[PDB]
């Protein structure tokens, strides 16, 4: 009994591979009500903050990409542009994840004007809007927020 | 699991990603056949109505796309074009879903003359017709209706 | 069995999507030998008969698409005159594959298909079906592809 | 015990034999109207669909009829004209039978412009309308639907 | 409630009386499906064999009847043309009946090419096709198979 | 409850009405095998004898029918009469007795044996066609048929 | 606990009395949905047919006014009606509308004369019915609304 | 049908108040159908008889209405009445009509001065009653119907 | 029954039948607050959402009426170019506010404007009909949606 | 049942709707006679007080009735307001308490006793007509009626 989440994950991974641009997708962890309570009772412990950190690191890593050779990803968010896709369902947690990601980007140095927020009706339509945001040149990386796991 | 349903979902998702055009599909194979029969008639249980609303919203959002800037989309269906794919199997429910979708489009503003309907014998044959419909330039969104059991 | 069926179905679907040419694949759900033998006896038609009918309908639907004032509705006719089909048959469970092939051929002839247009390909097992189906579909003079598989 | 069904069947058979034109009549085999509703709700093939297919086959056979050599009827409906007789009683099922027959004819090649439909108030009035339709020169076959339950 | 069988029998009898041509008809109703299959599988002979023999006898009788003295039907199938009507429905026994009739004809002397076969969707549609087959001038007899 | 007897009776009655010629058919269903054997053994109880007597009376009546209160009556003079006897090979052990009884009745009532035409059919089912063939001859005044059930 | 089934009926009756024009209303919400489903498949008509017949009779009666015995003829030729349907329970509302339309057409009404108005719920039936009845070219009003 | 039963009475009362004309309506709802069937032609008097008597009294009173003491007489001479009947439960509606007509005739009313209008049901009774009451040559209106 | 609810419904219906302007009223009687909280949590929306949709459809239908062979009048769900008046009763505000939010979101998503939307708050359900009549007697207002409180 | 209360409520509502002037009505004994006699204004339980406050709010709202989104909010200022008070002689032991509560509310919210009009009717049945007579006056902004059943 798991179709939507698997399809969304496969589509996001395929889009990331095709467009060679970072797309970060976070899945809900092991529960719905308990997970909601924990993510509402912690700020930095939400998956959105970690996803934003990963997106910033990946954008820096790609910017650097374009004894031995070491390719490490910086966390400097200055000059970066991001695109966020948010599922409208389970908005009581999607909004919290969006606010955590935005707060992380702002505190790490990303301007709010560089953040583009798109709200899709459900998790089913996340990949196509993520593809549009990724196919935009200015948008360095994409963060996806969907909650359809248990 | 259901190989046919998995194939339908995977093919529709891949076609949507490849053609970057809004494609919507509703899966109700998990629900009981009797439950689907009961759901066929009510005020808003029409999965066709829900899918048509989602397709209209996605078409408007894509037309718009083509503090933080926020894009959500509007439910105005005026001037929009849709392609509907229907599975003839379990027609007693598929036709009801298609009628609900058509009613949703018409009452949200879409013209019935701008709706194209393609009938295929089964869900196993839905995806290729859906892709052929999505390939057309004059189609703004695609909605597919196939139910098993 | 599960892996073989999943691989065959996925490959046939991918080939159909890639080549934009209709294909049909029919198997009885988790059938056994005795149950399949019992299901073989029928009067309306077999799984091969239904697959042939679906292939004809899809071929006409495609010809209409790529060839009502109130609302534009497109469907496929069941006429089989002038149509050419490819057929793939596995040798495993031949006692049922032959019945399916006979039903499909009878359906095609009855609806108007020509035996000369009918083309048949034999494969050892269901695993080798997708590649032969793709080879038949890649031919220009083939309008639809039908394949018969065995599931246990 | 029954009289209406017997009289209708006998009259239709006598008319077919007299006029040398194919007439196929279908009644409700199921004893329960709920089972009749289920049979209407079944897949594409229904009683009306089967009756239309039989009428098409008989018309094709009569196009030529009207190591042994074998004659069989084809299923091509191109150029064929049919008459349909339907009773108004149990319309909730008669309409389904008519829809199935029309769909079968159209998808086998018949034109809706060549289909003539006559509705009689009851099954008792089927024979007269069927004979009137069959006496027309431009009618190849007659399909009658009656209710037995 | 055997309306189908009654209608078929009455129509075939009426057509035979009207056209003055030998018509034979065979049905199996008193036995169930398994009993009918067993009786068809019996080595004594299918009902098609008996129907073909009766048709041969009637045709040979009519050869002299249409063109104390006693007239009886002969069993010479040489120079006899037979029209056989069969139903696609339940083709597990109708085909056996057809093969038994064909074997009877071919072993009593009937040329294989003379036999004509017409297959109809149903027993309800049998009578009209049988009458149409009978109307032909070059038909000695008409055999019909019904399943019910 | 029966097919052959009803069909034969109806066909013979229709033929008699159509050809306005006396056609008499004798069939018994109440009598069992033992009763039929007893009737065959008894000369005066021969159903064939009774049928021959009825045919002679009908022919004599029709001789004047076709050519105070006035009453038309039929005689039993078999002189100058011709009859056609149809016999079924099934249950020949009794059919032969009936034929012998009818022949004896005709001969002893005045009919010449040379004027009697006998036609043998295999079963009771195909009696009516042979009966009609005999009745369509001008010389045959009446038709006598026997059957067993 | 009856609110809609009383308010709608009272409003329709008051509007009919005020406008002096026949208004008929369908009130069957006191029974079960199984009963409604059974009524869906019945004889020529169950609710809409009867309502249309009553409206036709009332219009024919009023055509005269607007030991004497007055009764309404059932001839619908030359009559105009306003049909009010609720989208709620459309599975039954469509059947009622079909029955009413068939009754009017087969009794003599013209499809051009027939006018149809749809309202989202039974709550808005009275106001639309009054708006339709205020038209001069409307001879009778029929309304069907079912509440689950 | 409680809503319809209340609506009929409310509409009749409102029409009587508006038109200032006597309207007499008789119905029993706190009983059973067996009792209604049993009370078919009671010797003491039908309900329509009482309704007609009340209508006659009201007409006589209003003839003068159109210490002062006003009392109504039972003389029906020179009076005109409008009777409304329902086609449902006609087996009792006809009895009520006969009782009312007998009361009017035996109190002095002429059969020529009585106008009778029949409507399909109680839902259609009040509008016809109001239309009849609108006539100038009608002194009183009598309506009776059975609805549960 | 409940006198307050019955009187409010009758008054609103009489006002609608007198002014021939759409007035939509929604009341639900269930468990005191649990059912309303669950309805607010439901993704579909609240009763106010459906009431606003009905009001928009009725307004479009009335506009069409005022201006095959059969003539069919239907109202679209587009809220563009339409102005409505919303009445809210302060009692059970924890649910009245949710209903108002749902109605506002429905109107704006379907095409309404914040300037078009007008909100009037009253001390209770009993006072709704007069406020709704005063809202309806404005020429600019096209329809009236009234939200009550029923336990 | 409750013919008197139903008639009073219907008449007051119809008169208020017809005359487009605020009308408030309050009834004792919502539970029982014992509850009514024990709820004789224990502490801020005066129904007349609440009715007068509602009337003041409605009068202030109608004073205006007569950002981008415009919202109408009531006021609790009784200054310059004129009211019509209707009371019944039956159960006057509680009628006087209700009248005193309403008058106290008006005075302490800003109303003057000279602007208050008091009407006494024999019972609740005569309340609607007196309330309508008070409302038909031009110099009356709101009508407050106290009805009591026992």
Short mmCIF file of C-alpha atoms in Angstrom, two decimals, chain H residues 68-117:
data_model
loop_
_atom_site.label_atom_id
_atom_site.label_comp_id
_atom_site.label_asym_id
_atom_site.label_seq_id
_atom_site.Cartn_x
_atom_site.Cartn_y
_atom_site.Cartn_z
CA UNK H 68 -76.29 44.61 19.20
CA UNK H 69 -76.64 40.82 18.92
CA UNK H 70 -75.70 39.01 15.71
CA UNK H 71 -76.82 35.41 15.22
CA UNK H 72 -76.83 33.22 12.12
CA UNK H 73 -79.86 31.47 10.65
CA UNK H 74 -80.01 28.20 8.72
CA UNK H 75 -82.02 29.44 5.72
CA UNK H 76 -80.17 28.56 2.50
CA UNK H 77 -82.62 30.24 0.11
CA UNK H 78 -80.92 32.56 -2.36
CA UNK H 79 -77.41 31.44 -1.40
CA UNK H 80 -74.57 30.42 -3.72
CA UNK H 81 -71.65 28.22 -2.72
CA UNK H 82 -68.35 27.08 -4.20
CA UNK H 83 -67.33 23.49 -3.42
CA UNK H 84 -63.77 22.19 -3.80
CA UNK H 85 -63.11 18.44 -3.81
CA UNK H 86 -59.98 16.29 -3.97
CA UNK H 87 -59.52 13.28 -6.24
CA UNK H 88 -57.57 11.37 -3.57
CA UNK H 89 -59.66 9.15 -1.28
CA UNK H 90 -62.59 9.83 -3.59
CA UNK H 91 -64.53 6.97 -1.97
CA UNK H 92 -65.01 9.34 0.99
CA UNK H 93 -64.71 12.66 -0.87
CA UNK H 94 -67.81 11.77 -2.90
CA UNK H 95 -69.69 10.93 0.30
CA UNK H 96 -68.72 14.31 1.77
CA UNK H 97 -69.83 16.06 -1.43
CA UNK H 98 -73.16 14.23 -1.38
CA UNK H 99 -73.71 15.14 2.26
CA UNK H 100 -72.93 18.81 1.66
CA UNK H 101 -75.18 18.95 -1.41
CA UNK H 102 -78.02 17.24 0.47
CA UNK H 103 -77.64 19.69 3.37
CA UNK H 104 -77.72 22.69 1.02
CA UNK H 105 -80.72 21.39 -0.94
CA UNK H 106 -82.74 20.49 2.16
CA UNK H 107 -81.92 23.84 3.79
CA UNK H 108 -83.03 25.70 0.67
CA UNK H 109 -80.09 26.00 -1.68
CA UNK H 110 -80.54 25.33 -5.38
CA UNK H 111 -78.39 22.84 -7.26
CA UNK H 112 -77.97 25.43 -10.02
CA UNK H 113 -76.32 27.84 -7.56
CA UNK H 114 -73.64 25.30 -6.57
CA UNK H 115 -70.28 25.23 -8.36
CA UNK H 116 -68.10 22.13 -7.90
CA UNK H 117 -64.40 21.99 -8.77
#
